[PDB]
Amino acid sequence: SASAVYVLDLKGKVLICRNYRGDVDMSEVEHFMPILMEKEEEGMLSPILAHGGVRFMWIKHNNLYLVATSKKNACVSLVFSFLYKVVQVFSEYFKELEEESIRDNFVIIYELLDELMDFGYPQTTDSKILQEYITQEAPRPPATVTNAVSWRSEGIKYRKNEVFLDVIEAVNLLVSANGNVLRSEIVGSIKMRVFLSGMPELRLGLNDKVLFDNTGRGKSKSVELEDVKFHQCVRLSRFENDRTISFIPPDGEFELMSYRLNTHVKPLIWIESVIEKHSHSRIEYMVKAKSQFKRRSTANNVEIHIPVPNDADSPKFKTTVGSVKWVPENSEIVWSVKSFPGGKEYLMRAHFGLPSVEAEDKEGKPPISVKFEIPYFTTSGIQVRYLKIIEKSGYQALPWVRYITQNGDYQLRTQ
Partner 1 sequence: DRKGGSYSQAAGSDSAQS
Partner 2 sequence: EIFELKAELNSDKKEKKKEAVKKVIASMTVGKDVSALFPDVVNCMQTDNLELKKLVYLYLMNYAKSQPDMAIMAVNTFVKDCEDPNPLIRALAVRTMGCIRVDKITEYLCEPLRKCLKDEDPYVRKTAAVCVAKLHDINAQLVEDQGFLDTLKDLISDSNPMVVANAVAALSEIAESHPSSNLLDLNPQSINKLLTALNECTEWGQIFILDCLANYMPKDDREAQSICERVTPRLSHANSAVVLSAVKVLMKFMEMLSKDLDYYGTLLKKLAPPLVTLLSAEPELQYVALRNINLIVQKRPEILKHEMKVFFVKYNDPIYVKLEKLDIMIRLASQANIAQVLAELREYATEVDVDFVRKAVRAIGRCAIKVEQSAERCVSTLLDLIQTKVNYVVQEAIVVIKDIFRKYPNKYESVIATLCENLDSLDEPEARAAMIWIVGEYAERIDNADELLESFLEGFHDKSTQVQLQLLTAIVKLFLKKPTETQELVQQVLSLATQDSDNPDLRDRGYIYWRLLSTDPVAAKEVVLAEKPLISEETDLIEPTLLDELICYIGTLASVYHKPPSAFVE
Partner 3 sequence: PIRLRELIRTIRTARTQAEEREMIQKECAAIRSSFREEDNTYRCRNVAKLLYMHMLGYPAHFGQLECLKLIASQKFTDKRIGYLGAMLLLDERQDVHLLMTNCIKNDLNHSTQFVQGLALCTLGCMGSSEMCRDLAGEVEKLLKTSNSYLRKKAALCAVHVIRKVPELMEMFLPATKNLLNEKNHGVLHTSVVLLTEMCERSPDMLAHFRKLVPQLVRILKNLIMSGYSPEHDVSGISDPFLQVRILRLLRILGRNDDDSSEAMNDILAQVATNTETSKNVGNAILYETVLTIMDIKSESGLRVLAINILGRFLLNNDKNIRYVALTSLLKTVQTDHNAVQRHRSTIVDCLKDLDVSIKRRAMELSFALVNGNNIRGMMKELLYFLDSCEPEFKADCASGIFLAAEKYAPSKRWHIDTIMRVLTTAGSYVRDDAVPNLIQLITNSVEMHAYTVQRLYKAILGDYSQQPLVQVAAWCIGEYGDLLVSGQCEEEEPIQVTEDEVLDILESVLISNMSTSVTRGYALTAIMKLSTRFTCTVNRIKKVVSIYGSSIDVELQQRAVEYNALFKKYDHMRSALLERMPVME
Q: Is 356 in the site for partner 3 (CB under 8 A)?
A: yes
According to CB under 8 A, which one of 260, 401, 409, 414 is a site residue for partner 1?
401
CA-CA distance, 117 to 73, in Å (whole number)?
18
Q: Are 304 and 335 in contact (CB under 8 A)?
A: yes
Q: Is 300 in the site for partner 1 (CB under 8 A)?
A: yes
- Say which residues have a Cβ less than 8 Å from residue 170's Cβ, sequence separation at least 6: 186, 187, 188, 189, 406, 407, 408, 409
Find which of partner 2, partner 1, partner 3, none residue 55 binds, CB within 5 to 8 Å per kind. Answer: partner 2
Smaller CB separation from partner 3, 120 or 309 = 309
Smaller CB separation from partner 1, 33 or 190 = 190
Buried b (16+ CB within 10 A) or exposed e, 283-308: bebebebbbebeeebbbeebbbbbbb
x/- track of binding to partner 1 for residues 174-203 (CB under 8 A) = -----------------------------x
Q: Is 353 in the site for partner 3 (CB under 8 A)?
A: yes
**Which long-range contacts does 31-36 make (Cβ < 8 Å, 24+ apart)?**
32/8, 32/56, 32/67, 32/69, 33/8, 36/65
Residues 202-241 that bind partner 1 (CB under 8 A): 203, 205, 215, 217
CA-CA distance, 328 to 411, in Å (whole number)?
20
x/- track of binding to partner 1 for residues 60-89 (CB under 8 A) = ------------------------------
The site for partner 1, by CB under 8 A, has a size of 26
Smaller CB separation from partner 3, 237 or 314 = 314
User: DSSP letter string over 202-217?
Assistant: EEEEE-BHHHHHHHT-
Q: Which range in 32-40, 129-137, 227-235, 383-391 contacts partner 1 by CB under 8 A?
A: 383-391
Continuous segment of H or E residues that includes residue 164: strand 162-175
Residue 232's closest CA among 125, 387, 80, 84? 125
Other Cβ atoms closer than 10 A to 28? 21
Q: What's the closest the beta carbon of residue 345 comes to partner 2, in angstroms?
A: 26
Residues 111-170 that bind partner 1 (CB under 8 A): 164-166, 168
Q: Is 388 in the site for partner 1 (CB under 8 A)?
A: yes
Find which of partner 2, partner 1, partner 3, none residue 311 binds, CB within 5 to 8 Å per kind. Answer: partner 3
**Binding site residues, partner 1, CB under 8 A:** 164-166, 168, 203, 205, 215, 217, 300, 373, 375-377, 384-389, 398-404
